[PDB]
């Protein structure tokens, strides 16, 4: 090193080897920020469980007080009066066959798409344009249900979605560095207990190999 | 290895100074000979006292053991013939008093079996290690000198 001036002035506040206690650093997390974009604190977990076998692949989503670090714009594909119930619960766009032409042609202004089972006949024709975005609803993960009003509300309330990468590693954001550091020790447990309930059916003995926590292009914190 | 010095090893450091040395070089030489101690301030005055009770067996011969050096040790330059030529090379010597005498123009008698040669026998006019006992484990250097042809 060789290091950029934006971070060289933050090493004027922090040690290069110490990982700081999240119960003691509660005034320091807001103080190491330097970027022209919003910096975060993200959790890095090592697995496992088998590093190759896809039967032990981990997937899911967990609800948090700040979700992904922002609110989401939710769209709902539903016919008749059940669509007005989702519009009053958390949807900002109601979808129908007239909207399935626009999504296929290329234009979409929403973070999450939910559908009801008799409306899912239309959305089934969008599976290849919604696929590479992770935007496609699927009954086998609950993103298709008759109670669409509760399903749009589950997304609007703020949730984070995950799956493990190659050789068994998984990374997820748990707050902005400017957000209340007092709650990091509380929200980390709500993330961990939910990820621990997501253990595979054929998992045996162990599940976590190592846990680490760091800031965007910045220092690590200790638990 | 952090140690404190107890001897005149001025090429390694000063007396009573704290220096870093290798653990093997300490264990094989500086520790067993009474020249250095591990740098633990509360345990060194004891290791010094342990050396004083072993000094009390020859302290009187560090004071007086040479009739010609009664209060302080002397350095002397040789006065006996170097038994060489202009090439500075010779067959050497076999006589245990044929060398190292520094008062040759005088009625002073050279000591029997008290000479010590730390590097080997003098086979050249070159400057080399040469000493005479005052006691069985206590020695004084003398400076080799080119004399006669």
């Amino acid at each position: 090193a060789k290091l950029t001036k934006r971070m060289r002035v933050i090493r004027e506040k922090v040690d290069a080897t110490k990982q700081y206690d999240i119960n003691e650093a509660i005034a320091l997390l807001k103080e190491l920020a330097t970027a022209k974009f919003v910096e975060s604190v993200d959790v890095a977990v090592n697995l496992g469980i088998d590093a190759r076998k896809s039967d032990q692949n981990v997937r899911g989503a967990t609800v948090l007080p700040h979700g992904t670090g922002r609110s989401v714009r939710v769209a709902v594909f539903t016919q008749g009066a059940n669509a007005e119930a989702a519009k009053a619960a958390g949807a900002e766009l109601v979808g129908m066959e007239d909207l399935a032409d626009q999504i296929k042609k290329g234009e979409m202004n929403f973070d999450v798409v939910i559908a009801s089972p008799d409306a899912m006949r239309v959305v089934g024709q969008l599976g290849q344009v919604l696929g590479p975005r992770g935007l496609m609803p699927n009954p086998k993960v609950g993103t298709v249900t008759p109670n669409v009003a509760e399903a749009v509300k589950n997304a609007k309330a703020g949730q984070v979605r995950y799956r493990n990468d190659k050789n068994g590693i998984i990374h997820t954001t748990i707050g902005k560095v400017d957000f209340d550091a007092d709650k990091l020790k509380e929200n980390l447990e709500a993330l961990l207990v939910a990820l621990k309930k997501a253990k595979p059916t054929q998992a045996k003995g162990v599940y976590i190999k190592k846990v680490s926590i760091s800031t965007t292009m910045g220092a690590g914190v200790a638990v | 290895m952090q140690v404190i010095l107890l001897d005149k090893v001025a090429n390694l450091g000063s007396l009573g100074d704290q220096v870093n040395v290798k653990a093997g070089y300490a264990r094989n030489f500086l520790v067993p000979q009474g020249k250095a101690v591990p740098a633990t301030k509360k345990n060194i005055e004891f290791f010094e006292a342990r050396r004083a009770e072993l000094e009390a067996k020859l302290a009187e011969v560090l004071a007086a053991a040479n009739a010609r050096a009664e209060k302080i040790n002397a350095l002397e330059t040789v006065t006996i013939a170097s038994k060489a030529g202009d090439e500075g090379k010779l067959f050497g010597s076999i006589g245990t008093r044929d060398i190292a005498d520094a008062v040759t123009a005088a009625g002073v008698e050279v000591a029997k079996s008290e000479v010590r040669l730390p590097n080997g026998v003098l086979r050249t006019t070159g400057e080399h290690e040469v000493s005479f006992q005052v006691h069985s484990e206590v020695f004084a250097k003398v400076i080799v000198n080119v004399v006669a042809e």
Partner: protein, 77 residues
Amino acid sequence: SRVCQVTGKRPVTGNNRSHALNATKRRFLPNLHSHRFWVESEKRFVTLRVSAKGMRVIDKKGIDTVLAELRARGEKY
């Protein structure tokens, strides 16, 4: 006797055991090698056979304390 000449630690018998379970007497012999020392009293140097823990008494008390009690047990060094 092949001993550490300052402590008198000697070869002896017992049971060593095989790689698995079974008895083996085999005769025991402690590790031993030569080392040179100044003695003061003979005004010369000597070679003596010394080993484990016995060389450590010389480490704890010095060569003037340990070697001065030798040459009484019919000692041939």
